[PDB]
Write an enzyme that holds these catalytic residues in place. Structure first.
Site, PDB file in Angstrom:
ATOM      1  N   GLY A   1      51.626  72.294  29.155  1.00  0.00           N
ATOM      2  CA  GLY A   1      53.051  72.279  28.179  1.00  0.00           C
ATOM      3  C   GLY A   1      52.680  71.636  26.950  1.00  0.00           C
ATOM      4  O   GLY A   1      53.122  71.063  26.561  1.00  0.00           O
ATOM      5  N   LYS A   2      51.505  72.323  26.192  1.00  0.00           N
ATOM      6  CA  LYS A   2      51.492  72.125  24.875  1.00  0.00           C
ATOM      7  C   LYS A   2      52.191  72.839  23.984  1.00  0.00           C
ATOM      8  O   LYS A   2      52.764  71.886  22.915  1.00  0.00           O
ATOM      9  CB  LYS A   2      49.881  72.924  24.494  1.00  0.00           C
ATOM     10  CG  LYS A   2      48.765  72.450  25.337  1.00  0.00           C
ATOM     11  CD  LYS A   2      47.495  72.979  25.098  1.00  0.00           C
ATOM     12  CE  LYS A   2      47.681  74.260  25.629  1.00  0.00           C
ATOM     13  NZ  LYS A   2      46.265  74.958  25.895  1.00  0.00           N
ATOM     14  N   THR A   3      52.987  73.724  24.224  1.00  0.00           N
ATOM     15  CA  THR A   3      53.828  74.362  23.495  1.00  0.00           C
ATOM     16  C   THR A   3      55.226  73.654  23.913  1.00  0.00           C
ATOM     17  O   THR A   3      56.049  72.924  22.867  1.00  0.00           O
ATOM     18  CB  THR A   3      54.326  75.687  23.961  1.00  0.00           C
ATOM     19  OG1 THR A   3      53.241  76.495  24.010  1.00  0.00           O
ATOM     20  CG2 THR A   3      55.433  76.219  23.133  1.00  0.00           C
TER      21      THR A   3
ATOM     22  N   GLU B   1      34.918  75.509  62.976  1.00  0.00           N
ATOM     23  CA  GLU B   1      35.745  74.569  62.478  1.00  0.00           C
ATOM     24  C   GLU B   1      36.042  73.370  63.264  1.00  0.00           C
ATOM     25  O   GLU B   1      35.861  72.154  62.614  1.00  0.00           O
ATOM     26  CB  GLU B   1      37.093  75.207  62.030  1.00  0.00           C
ATOM     27  CG  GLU B   1      36.962  76.639  61.438  1.00  0.00           C
ATOM     28  CD  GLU B   1      36.102  76.533  60.179  1.00  0.00           C
ATOM     29  OE1 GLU B   1      36.198  75.753  59.217  1.00  0.00           O
ATOM     30  OE2 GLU B   1      34.991  77.525  60.467  1.00  0.00           O
TER      31      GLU B   1
ATOM     32  N   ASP C   1      26.975  80.331  56.423  1.00  0.00           N
ATOM     33  CA  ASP C   1      27.562  80.230  55.183  1.00  0.00           C
ATOM     34  C   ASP C   1      27.399  78.536  54.783  1.00  0.00           C
ATOM     35  O   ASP C   1      26.860  78.385  53.890  1.00  0.00           O
ATOM     36  CB  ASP C   1      29.036  80.504  55.146  1.00  0.00           C
ATOM     37  CG  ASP C   1      29.302  81.964  54.574  1.00  0.00           C
ATOM     38  OD1 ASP C   1      28.652  82.300  53.481  1.00  0.00           O
ATOM     39  OD2 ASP C   1      30.247  82.493  55.333  1.00  0.00           O
TER      40      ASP C   1
END
Lengths: 478, 441
Positions: free
Chosen positions: B2-4, B219, B301
């Site tokens: 939200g810079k604008t 998992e 992995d």
């Protein structure tokens, strides 16, 4: 088109000139006493080149010398000469030198020659061909054929190594003046001349301010002036004082001070690290003078910092001793050893993972920099055994420095505890109180003798042994 | 972030004219149009003083001349015109210029010089309280149910911008419309969160039972190892929130991990890193204790990350005390992300802090490799010994997750409580239904 109006900058409006100003008024003489120059059989040097770091006021210097010369001023960007098409740039520089010729007497200024003054043959493209064409056109306008004595060009480059050897050839760009970073007095003069335009107090000693912002450009001094104009609404005081400029210099040197939520053991860890850093820094001559020691987090550095200013002349010349480096590695090994002395080897943190890499890099650099005494320097070999053995000496020096740091740290456990308590309690410590605690709780720090004492003892020893040889020859002969 | 929106708020609070324009609108095909537009915009701002000028995406115009058509010349001319206009500003004229950027590295350092951009303000992502306030603001515009607790979703979504929270609220409203709900329930919030994070659920796209029990084993073993390390040695590690094996987006399985506070993400000590290494090796430990000596690829992995992490213990951080002389860069780099394991305990796992040097001696390299292999083997043996002492709980959790296709961390904790260590397997194997849980959350 390429002419400017309202040039009034003089030598008074620019600050921190020095003997360069003398050369500057030489240009004024070149524009005023030129009849005496010509009567003595001297050609006017049409090429002066100002080289230095960006922000020193090269354009300001050109404006000042043009105003003091009293002639028309031309200031043109070199990026306009470079075009995606070929031919317009040569016409632009031809028309530029023509309108400079008819406006004689005049001085012209062309900034950032690095865009158009590159070597012929470093890029293979149409842009390079256009650059070569424009460079040759300016080459032939500057010296090529007879008919110019009254137009003088002024150049301002940051990288003089990219300059064409054709341009620096005598007759085109002969005078080379370096404008360096301001030292001490230049910083005073620049700060005062930028501060004339703001109401200011009479108790304002800028000496401490400039002693904080060492090695900074004049544009950065203008920035320091710029952080001395607004920020006072939060307190709402009367007049600009010393401490406001000191805090502005601290802000522009490190960053904005921000406070965030934190635990107590985190503060203890950070203050222990800063305590180790400062305690080891105290016991060595290379960084003895300590000014600040804080643990407040800043922008980009959550960790604390320490400030030391030993004379900046030895680093520039490169005269740093081996003992100067072997101590510093020990200083960079100050945090981790303290962890080993405080939380045990089984609970080493990861805050010192940056200073420990600096220590190992410094050890490797000292080993391969000729300062090692294994054979005699000799950081280069051919067979595999010696090349493999080079890296072992770095590990040995690292281990020796780590053990020295551990011994020094264990010597000062009481000073450790007092300064870490003060660091968690106050979050910032100045030179006076820190050195007071060092005096109260420090141990013996025998300073090694310097070069002068060693020279004197060796000189007296040499004289006594040579006179010993004198009698052992004389009374044996007589 | 939200810079604008911040610039619009400044303009509204000041009550001054606001001239908003994008930088990419200054980049055209005809050279010189952008400079004329810059001059016209600055003239219009100078007519209506005081005023605020806003240039969005200024990096499109101020791209650095990187050394790694005529559009480049046009961009350079427009940037030079902008520099001339900014340098010619008198401070007493009351015109304020703002430039919004997402990549400060691409910006021209000429603009960063004093006199053009004097203030450089970094718009950080909102914190938990800030995300809570943004969620309150965006939920004030839509009918909300009282069962929705915005604090939990503010705390559980770190790094989410205000626009992402608005998209979350809008997607939850869309889900409530799809489910014909009169208001956004907590279930709609959870569905929108899962849609943005791990993606929407597919329709019956399932593989065989062989390739699914392996992912379940991995998992469940990771979650069980993490919970056991929390239970026994009081490790400062994360918590398993829920485990799913339904494909979502591009992931065939997932373990949601609750992110700890950032104050514990700086002083990572050796026991914490060793326990996290044990958690990483717990998957292959589960494959070894459950499926014997016939392991699979689904646990390699994690086996990669541990094989890197111990290296960062020995070379980059230098935590052991035979001191090393140089670090090494990671040969493989993996981005920190969602439901995959945290690997951001020190901000990131595969990001060396420029602490690498090229080697000269090659014997220290094999010494470091030997030490790393020894540490990895020791930690793997430790986690295998820990997991093998609790087999009934692990197998029960595997069967429950295989039946329900989802499980929660509190369910895993209840399985651990109901199954103490060293219980025989016949107690689990004699039950009427192993994939049944008598706990109703």
């Amino acid at each position: 088109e390429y002419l400017e109006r309202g040039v009034d900058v003089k030598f008074t409006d620019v600050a921190g000139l020095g003997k360069i100003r003398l050369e500057l008024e030489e240009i004024v003489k070149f524009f005023t006493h030129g009849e005496m120059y010509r009567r003595r059989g001297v050609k006017i040097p049409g090429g002066i080149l100002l080289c230095g770091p960006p922000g020193v006021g090269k354009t300001l210097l050109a404006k000042a010398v043009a105003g003091e010369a009293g002639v028309n001023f031309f200031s043109i960007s070199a990026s306009q000469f470079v075009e995606i098409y070929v031919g317009v740039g040569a016409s632009r520089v031809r028309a530029l030198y023509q309108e400079a010729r008819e406006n004689a007497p005049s001085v012209v200024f062309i900034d950032e020659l690095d865009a158009v003054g590159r070597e012929r043959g470093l890029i293979k493209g149409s842009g390079g061909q256009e650059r070569d064409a424009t460079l040759n056109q300016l080459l032939v306008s500057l010296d090529g054929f007879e008919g110019r004595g009254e137009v003088i060009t002024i150049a301002s480059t940051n990288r003089p190594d990219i300059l064409d050897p054709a341009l620096v050839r005598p007759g085109r760009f002969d005078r080379k003046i370096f404008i360096p970073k301001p030292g001490l007095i230049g910083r005073m003069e620049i700060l005062q001349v930028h501060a004339r335009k703001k109401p200011m107090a009479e108790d304002l000693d800028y000496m401490a301010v400039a002693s904080m912002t060492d090695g900074m450009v004049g544009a950065e001094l203008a920035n320091i002036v710029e952080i001395a104009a607004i920020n006072m609404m939060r307190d709402g005081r009367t007049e600009l004082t010393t401490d406001d400029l000191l805090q502005a210099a601290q802000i522009e040197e490190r960053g904005m001070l921000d406070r965030k939520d934190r635990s107590l053991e985190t503060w203890r860890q950070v203050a222990i690290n800063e305590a180790a850093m400062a305690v080891v820094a105290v016991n060595f001559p290379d960084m003895k003078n300590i000014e600040f020691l804080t643990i407040n987090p800043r922008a980009g550095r959550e960790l604390g910092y320490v400030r030391v200013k030993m004379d900046h002349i030895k680093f520039k010349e490169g005269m740093l001793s081996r003992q100067s480096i072997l101590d510093h590695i020990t200083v960079q090994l100050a945090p981790r050893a303290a962890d080993e002395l405080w939380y045990g080897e089984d609970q080493l943190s990861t805050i010192w993972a940056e200073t420990s890499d600096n220590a190992r890099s410094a050890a490797r650099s000292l080993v391969l920099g000729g300062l090692s005494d294994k054979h005699h320097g000799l950081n280069n070999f051919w067979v595999a055994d010696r090349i493999n053995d080079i890296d072992v000496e770095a590990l040995r020096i690292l281990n020796m420095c780590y053990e020295r740091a551990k011994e020094i740290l264990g010597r000062n456990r009481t000073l450790m505890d007092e300064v870490v308590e003060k660091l968690v309690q106050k979050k910032s410590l100045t030179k006076q109180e820190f050195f007071t605690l060092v005096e109260l709780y420090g141990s013996s720090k025998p300073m090694p003798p310097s070069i002068l004492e060693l020279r004197k003892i060796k000189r007296l020893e040499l004289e006594e042994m040579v006179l010993k040889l004198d009698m052992t020859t004389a009374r044996n002969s007589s | 972030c939200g810079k604008t929106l911040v610039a619009k708020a400044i303009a509204g609070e000041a009550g001054v004219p606001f001239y908003q324009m994008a930088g990419s609108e200054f980049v055209e095909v005809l050279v010189g149009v952008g400079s004329a537009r810059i001059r016209d915009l600055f003239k219009r701002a100078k007519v209506n003083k005081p005023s605020v000028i806003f240039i969005d995406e200024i990096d499109a115009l101020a791209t650095r001349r990187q050394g790694i058509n005529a559009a480049t010349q046009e961009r350079e001319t427009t940037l030079n015109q902008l520099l001339i206009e900014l340098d010619g500003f008198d401070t007493g004229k009351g015109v304020i210029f703002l430039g919004a950027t997402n990549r400060r590295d691409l910006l021209d350092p000429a603009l960063l010089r004093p006199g053009r951009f004097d203030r450089k303000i970094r718009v950080r992502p909102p914190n938990a309280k800030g995300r809570l306030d943004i969620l309150k603001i965006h939920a004030s515009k839509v009918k909300m149910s009282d069962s929705v607790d915005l604090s939990s979703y503010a705390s559980n979504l770190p790094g989410w911008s205000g626009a992402k929270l608005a998209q979350l609220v809008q997607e939850a409203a869309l889900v409530a419309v799809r489910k014909t709900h009169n208001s956004i329930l907590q279930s709609d919030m959870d569905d929108a969160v899962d849609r943005l994070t791990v993606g929407p659920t597919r329709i019956g796209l399932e593989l065989g039972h062989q390739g699914q029990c392996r992912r379940a084993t991995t998992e469940v073993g990771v979650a069980i190892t993490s919970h056991l390390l929390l239970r026994y040695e009081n490790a400062k590690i994360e918590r398993c929130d829920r485990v799913s094996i339904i494909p979502r987006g591009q992931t065939l399985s997932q373990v949601v991990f609750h992110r700890l506070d950032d104050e514990s993400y700086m002083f990572g000590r050796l026991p914490q890193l060793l326990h996290r290494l044990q958690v990483l090796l717990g998957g292959r430990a589960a494959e070894e204790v459950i499926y014997g000596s016939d392991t699979s690829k689904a646990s390699v992995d994690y086996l990669s990350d541990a094989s890197w992490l111990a290296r960062k213990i020995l070379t980059i951080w230098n935590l052991e005390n035979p001191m090393v002389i140089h670090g090494e860069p990671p040969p493989w780099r993996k981005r920190p992300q969602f439901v995959g394991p945290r690997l951001d305990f020190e901000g990131s796992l595969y990001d060396d802090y420029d602490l690498v040097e090229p080697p000269v001696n090659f014997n220290m390299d094999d010494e470091v490799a030997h030490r790393s292999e020894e540490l990895i083997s020791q930690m793997y043996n430790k986690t295998v010994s820990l997991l093998r002492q609790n087999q009934t709980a692990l197998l029960k959790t595997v069967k429950v997750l295989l039946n329900q296709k989802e499980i929660s961390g509190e369910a895993i904790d209840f399985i651990l409580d109901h199954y103490p260590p060293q219980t025989p397997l016949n107690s689990l194997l004699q039950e009427q239904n192993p994939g049944s849980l008598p706990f109703v959350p």
